[PDB]
């Protein structure tokens, strides 16, 4: 009955989604002139990447002003228009709150490098906004996230004469949360956008706020306690608004970012731990990884909801699989050197799947049939490729391809003038892969996606239903139930590339009619001991309901 | 043992395939260059639409010189280099012998309409090359093939001042096969091209040579005599050349055109009867009508091979179905009255199936698993569309779409300057559908097609075996065996738009394992009464073997 539970999220980047000024970069008037596409696609809630003033050393995750609107994208007036227009269509909009760090260009860190005591004598209140060390020897058992760039997590600052902490890029100094004033600053940054009517934030790099000696400085308890404070605020001051976390960690630690009915934290976390096992299972044709990891997720509080996703603006991340699993995921999905960046693969959905529609359709149904609310990477619903010529994780962020005209419909600037080049190779280029062509293709991947979402939308068990795996006895075939209110769903997906047989244990269901959700065609009723034989085509999926 | 029984045929018009010189019209130089393409797609034999001198009032089926090359297409020297280059890759090439009629522009008719005796009393030995009535009353109990356009099968010749007979356009006066010089002329024309090394003929519209009073003037015994004489000449003089027949009739009548081992006619006949029911079975989600019509075919002579196809240069033809079958086909496949011509539907394959890969793939697997030798219609391997802006069945004959170059790569002439305008609409134009994009696209329909052709080669039972339908007990699901040397193929294919269960009668095959043709994936061993419960996804096809 929470709104975000039955929602369907869509992730996009105002700078890559739609130009409006012909400038080569997208803007909020560009995004605003396309809200009819998102609603009519079947999106409920837009998640927009960071839109704040930034030098874009990390595409806006180095925020320079938490209450502004990056010029490229237009004005705070523009932003308040877009919020009115999406709200009129019944779309929620959530932003990206970058709590762990700011840009080195931020007024705060510009002030901070002035040292602790000021020229006139007085305290320098911004010095302890950030995290300083004299020689940089604290925190030594901590992994470095941005592997192909950073070599320490401490950087020397010329003016300050001291060292400063950054879990990410050197130009992204970490904020010091033992500073009470810093917590009050973010609360103030949140309140500003939540007073303009934003429906919540997806919160970034949450596990890295506090760092302590003798720990990996991930998932610390005092970090969790900061986060409950946000939840505490937003619950009191904005009943309704949504906190959604990106906690890339192992299933045992991720669930804690929900934390407790009495001490609530996030409303939604991403189900990072299933998403690599999905790709893994396609190559091993062995879905067992999916169950093992799903079984390491303990129950989440009543308010809690999983955000299911396949790709996103970051790389496909192998930071939380075993050493062998990572070796395997590079071997199978990263044959080239260029394809890998810091423990991960910078490739979009369709290249990863050899542009196989069956496989794209397979993983999308699993994404819609796994428990939670699903998020869609922009462009992936028409089958966009990538540009591995672009540096660091940007090749998956090429601009939305809207038609076959200039620069894909994204701009009227020539492709070489756009912020990222719009893709125009023979396979995934906008002349072949574009939204106009797919609004008129009765069988386009666009129309299949939207049909799929109508199909999920008609069956509340997909959002709120429980989940129960059933044994099948063929590891290529994955099957499970979703029961909720009236109906019980039965979802059986073939993860292998040719016809597979399988013996489903439907013991608890003897005597039910299993029927197709698309048009109610009947299969045999379950009888005897409830071992239900099935054959599946290559990469098939059956979405079924069990009548009784 | 005969080469044509193992061949895969590719139908193509030179005038629309590849242009060599930028004059806007495809030619033999152009085609010669694309022979590596057909070779690699999996084609063995080229069937070339009429290349002869013609007014092109019926796309060159109105011939004005049997022993020459239409300027538009190149020289006779071009032709010889083409055959050298096509043979050098081990391809066969069959032409199109138009026996029943010539153009009104043909010298024989221009001589014929001079009348019976010349103004100098001497007698016109060219007048009864054709079929002359003084008032146009004979053969009144016959039908008008080109119903949409010709009002009568007699037309008044203003010059000779009497009626001549045509089954087709008034521009296509019928030849008079009761005059022995005509049969001589026709054999002589066949010998011209067979002397040049051409490998055979598709003989056009064979049911209509002889017209006889009081009859339906089709399938007369006298035409089969004429046709037997042709076969005799081939047999005796050029052994080993193919004769194929456009015999669009009812099944009991089509087999007559192979005519006995004692005195044979055609090596091959197109299986017109199964084609309409494939389309019909797919909208009716019921495959009865297929089994039905296949039984109505008698077994054919040893030499004979059936020739399956889905589409061709002509319309999808509905003359040989019941009127309620026609009422259904029109209502399901022609939602616009323009879409229907001459008791048929003039659309390409992909528009017909709504550009739906699973449906395009399903009918293509059936083409390849049904008994006989399959014909691909040019461009259908890439999912080409139709251009109804072009009159009379030319909407399916648009230029080949090779790349997204200026005219789709067909010509350097720009689109408005070609013979037919290359398709450029959003869904089917060369910007989106073309050979080059599909050569690089791992999952392209072109590639799926080369692999399936590849897999049909791995199993000689596909070209040479028998056909035996299995029970299934579900009209949607259609199953059958093909057996030939050691082996037994099992071809199960679903014709419904959603999952369907079945119960295959495989009692002849208890205790043996069905194994996947693609990946050698074994399925459970057949037990018990051999009744094999299965389930199929939407528009699926299971290609299997049943081992020793
Ligand atoms: Ca931190
Ligand atoms: Ca005739
Ligand atoms: Mg702009
Ligand atoms: Mg030419």
Q: Which residue of A has its CA nearest to B513?
A: A501
Q: Which helix (H) or strand (E) holds A544?
A: strand A541-547
Residue B62 in 3-state DSSP? coil
CB atoms within 10 A of CB B458: 10
Q: Given an 8 Å threshold on Cβ–Cβ distance, is B440 in contact with A432?
A: no
Residue B56 CA to ligand 4 center (angstroms) comes to 16
- DSSP per-residue codes, B463-488: HH---EE--TT-TTEEEEEEE-SS-E
Q: Which of A59, A72, A246, A361 is catalytic?
A: A246
The token pair at B365 is 């697997």
Residue A16 CA to ligand 3 center (angstroms) comes to 10
Contact A462, A482 (CB under 8 A): yes
Same-domain pairing of B476 and B542: yes
Query: By C-alpha distance, which of B221, B195, B249, B227 is closest to B99?
Result: B227
**DSSP bridge pairs for A165:** A154
Write out the residues surrounding ion ligand 2, Cβ under 5 A.
Answer: B 100, 174, 208-209
Which residue in B356, B440, B499 is closest to A516 by CB distance? B499
CA distances for A313 relative to A50, A369, A488, B154, angstroms = 12, 22, 35, 72
Q: How far apart are CA B544 and CA B548, in angstroms?
A: 13
Is A157 annotated to bind a ligand? Reply is no
Judging contacts by C-beta atoms under 8 Å, the chain B residues touching residue A536 are 535, 537
CB atoms within 10 A of CB B508: 13
Query: By C-alpha distance, which of B116, B105, B93 is closest to B61?
Result: B105
Residues 6+ apart with CB under 8 A from B427: A437, A440, A441, B355, B385
Domain total in chain A: 3
Query: By C-alpha distance, which of B207, B232, B230, B231 is closest to B220?
Result: B207
Is A209 annotated to bind a ligand? Reply is yes
Domain of residue B372, CATH code: 3.20.20.80
CA B368 to chain centre: 14
Q: How far apart are CA B17 and CA B72, in angstroms?
A: 12
Q: How far apart are CA A188 and CA A180, in angstroms?
A: 13
CA distance A300 to chain B (A): 34
Q: Given an 8 Å threshold on Cβ–Cβ distance, is B542 in contact with A535?
A: yes
CB atoms within 10 A of CB A479: 25
Q: Given an 8 Å threshold on Cβ–Cβ distance, is B499 in contact with A544?
A: yes
Contact A212, A220 (CB under 8 A): yes
> Is residue A204 among the annotated active site residues?
yes
Residue B410 in 3-state DSSP? coil
Round to the nearest angstrom and report the end-to-end CA distance of chain A: 26
CA distance A438 to chain B (A): 7
If phi > 0 it is left, if psi is from -120 to 50 it is alpha, else beta; for residue A435 that is alpha
SS3 content of chain A, % helix, strand, coil (to 5): 30, 20, 50
Residue B138 CA to ligand 2 center (angstroms) comes to 13
Residue A185 CA to ligand 2 center (angstroms) comes to 94
Q: How far apart are CA B155 and CA B166, in angstroms?
A: 8
Domain of residue A477, CATH code: 2.60.40.1180
CB atoms within 10 A of CB B441: 17
Same-domain pairing of A94 and A105: no
Same-domain pairing of B390 and B507: no
E strands present in B107-258? 132-133, 154-157, 162-165, 200-204, 242-245
Q: How far apart are CA A18 and CA A348, in angstroms?
A: 19
Domain boundary among A413, A439, A457: A457
Supply the range of the domain harboring residue A131. 101-174
> Is residue A292 among the annotated active site residues?
no
Query: By C-alpha distance, which of B48, B55, B52, B8 is closest to B30?
Result: B48
CA distance A223 to chain B (A): 47
CA distance B493 to chain A (A): 10
Q: Which residue of B has its CA nearest to A503?
A: B524
Same-domain pairing of A233 and A274: yes
CA distance A516 to chain B (A): 7
Q: How far apart are CA A67 and CA A358, in angstroms?
A: 44
Same-domain pairing of A202 and A123: no
Q: How far apart are CA B441 and CA A387, in angstroms?
A: 15
Which residue in B432, B442, B497 is closest to A355 by CB distance? B442
Same-domain pairing of A167 and A297: no
Way the structure was solved: X-ray
Same-domain pairing of B192 and B329: yes
Query: By C-alpha distance, which of B493, B454, B463, B453 is closest to B475?
Result: B493
Same-domain pairing of B365 and B265: yes
Which residue in B440, B523, B537 is closest to A537 by CB distance? B537
CB atoms within 10 A of CB B477: 26
Residue B155 CA to ligand 2 center (angstroms) comes to 14
Same-domain pairing of A334 and A425: yes
Q: How far apart are CA A308 and CA A467, in angstroms?
A: 14
Give the position of tokens 């079929």.
B131
CB atoms within 10 A of CB A102: 28
Which of B286, B499, B513, B516 to probe by mutation at the A interface, max A CB count within 10 Å?
B499
Residue B103 CA to ligand 2 center (angstroms) comes to 13
Judging contacts by C-beta atoms under 8 Å, the chain A residues touching residue B354 are 442-443
The token pair at A247 is 């906690």
Residue B314 CA to ligand 2 center (angstroms) comes to 20
Residues 6+ apart with CB under 8 A from B5: B305, B373, B463, B464
Which residue in A356, A427, A501 is closest to B524 by CB distance? A501
Q: Given an 8 Å threshold on Cβ–Cβ distance, is A523 in contact with B501?
A: yes
Q: Which residue of A has its CA nearest to B432?
A: A432
Same-domain pairing of A425 and A440: yes
- DSSP per-residue codes, A453-516: HHHHHT-THHHH---EEE--S-TTEEEEEEE-SS-EEEEEEE-SSS-EEEEEE-GGGTT-EEEE
Residue B205 CA to ligand 2 center (angstroms) comes to 9
Same-domain pairing of B146 and B91: no
Domain boundary among A174, A192, A213: A174
Q: Given an 8 Å threshold on Cβ–Cβ distance, is B499 in contact with A441?
A: no
Q: Please give the positions of B annotated as active site.
A: 204, 246
Q: Given an 8 Å threshold on Cβ–Cβ distance, is A537 in contact with B533?
A: no
CB atoms within 10 A of CB B486: 9
Size of interface A-B (CB pairs under 8 A): 105
Domain of residue B135, CATH code: 3.90.400.10
Is B21 annotated to bind a ligand? Reply is yes
Contact A360, A278 (CB under 8 A): no
CA B486 to chain centre: 31
Is A546 annotated to bind a ligand? Reply is no
Judging contacts by C-beta atoms under 8 Å, the chain A residues touching residue B518 are 497-498, 538
Q: Given an 8 Å threshold on Cβ–Cβ distance, is A500 in contact with B519?
A: no
Query: By C-alpha distance, which of B247, B259, B325 is closest to B292?
Result: B325
Domain boundary among A423, A457, A491: A457
Q: Which residue of A has its CA nearest to B443?
A: A356
Ligand nearest, relative to CA of residue B411: 4
SS3 content of chain B, % helix, strand, coil (to 5): 30, 15, 50
Same-domain pairing of B12 and B81: yes
Q: Given an 8 Å threshold on Cβ–Cβ distance, is B541 in contact with A537?
A: yes
CA distance A523 to chain B (A): 5
Is B323 annotated to bind a ligand? Reply is no
At CB < 8 Å, which residues of chain A contact B? 354-357, 404, 425-427, 431-432, 436-437, 440-444, 496-501, 516, 518-519, 521-524, 533-538, 540-542, 544
């Amino acid at each position: 009955p929470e709104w975000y539970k039955s929602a369907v999220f869509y992730e996009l980047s105002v700078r890559t989604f739609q130009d409006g000024n012909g400038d080569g970069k997208g803007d909020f008037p560009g995004l605003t002139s396309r809200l009819d596409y998102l609603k009519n696609l079947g999106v409920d809630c837009l998640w927009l990447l960071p839109w704040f003033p930034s030098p874009l050393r990390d595409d806006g995750y180095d925020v320079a002003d938490y209450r502004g609107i990056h010029p490229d994208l237009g004005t705070l007036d523009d932003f308040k228009v877009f919020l009115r227009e999406a709200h009129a269509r019944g779309l929620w909009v959530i932003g990206d709150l970058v709590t762990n760090h700011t840009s080195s260009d931020h007024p705060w860190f510009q002030a901070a490098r002035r040292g602790p005591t000021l020229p006139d004598g007085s305290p320098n209140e911004y010095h302890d906004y950030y995290v300083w060390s004299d020689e940089g020897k604290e925190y030594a058992d901590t992994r470095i996230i941005f592997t192909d760039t950073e070599v320490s997590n401490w950087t020397l600052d010329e003016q300050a004469g001291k060292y400063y902490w950054h879990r990410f890029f050197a130009s992204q100094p970490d904020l010091n949360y033992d500073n009470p004033k810093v917590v009050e600053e973010l609360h103030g940054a949140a309140r500003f956008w939540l007073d303009l009517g934003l429906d919540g934030f997806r919160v970034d790099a949450v596990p890295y706020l506090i760092e302590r000696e003798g720990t990996s400085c991930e998932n610390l308890p005092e970090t969790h306690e900061i986060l409950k404070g946000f939840r505490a605020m937003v619950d009191r001051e904005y009943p309704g608004r949504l906190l959604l976390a990106e906690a890339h960690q192992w299933p045992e630690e991720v669930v804690e970012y929900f934390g407790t009915e009495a001490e609530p934290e996030f409303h939604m976390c991403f189900n990072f731990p299933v998403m690599p096992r999905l790709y893994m299972s396609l190559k091993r044709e062995d879905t067992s990884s999916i169950r093992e990891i799903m079984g390491r997720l303990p129950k989440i509080p009543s308010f809690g909801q999983w955000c299911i996703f396949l790709r996103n603006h970051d790389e496909l991340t192998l930071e939380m699989v075993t050493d062998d699993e990572r070796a395997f995921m590079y071997a199978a999905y990263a044959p080239d050197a260029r394809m890998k960046i810091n423990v991960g693969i910078r490739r979009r959905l369709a290249p990863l799947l050899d542009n196989d529609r069956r496989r794209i359709e397979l993983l999308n149904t699993v994404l819609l049939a796994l428990p939670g609310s699903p998020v869609l990477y922009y462009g992936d619903e028409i089958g966009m490729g990538d540009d591995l010529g672009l540096p660091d994780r940007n090749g998956v962020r090429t601009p939305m391809q809207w038609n076959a005209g200039t620069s894909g419909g994204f701009s009227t600037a020539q492709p070489s003038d756009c912020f990222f080049p719009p893709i125009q190779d023979p396979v995934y280029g906008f002349g072949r892969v574009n939204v106009q062509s797919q609004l008129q293709d009765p069988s386009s991947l666009l129309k299949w996606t939207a049909r799929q979402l109508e199909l999920r939308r008609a069956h509340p068990a997909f959002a709120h239903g429980d989940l129960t795996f059933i044994e099948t006895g063929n590891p290529a075939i994955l099957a499970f139930t979703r029961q909720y209110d009236g109906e019980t769903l039965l979802i059986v997906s073939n993860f292998a590339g040719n016809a597979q047989a399988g013996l489903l244990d439907l013991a608890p269901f003897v005597g039910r009619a299993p029927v197709t959700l698309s048009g109610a065609s009947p299969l045999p009723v379950v009888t005897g001991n409830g071992q239900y034989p099935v054959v599946m085509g290559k990469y098939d999926y059956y979405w079924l309901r069990l009548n009784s």
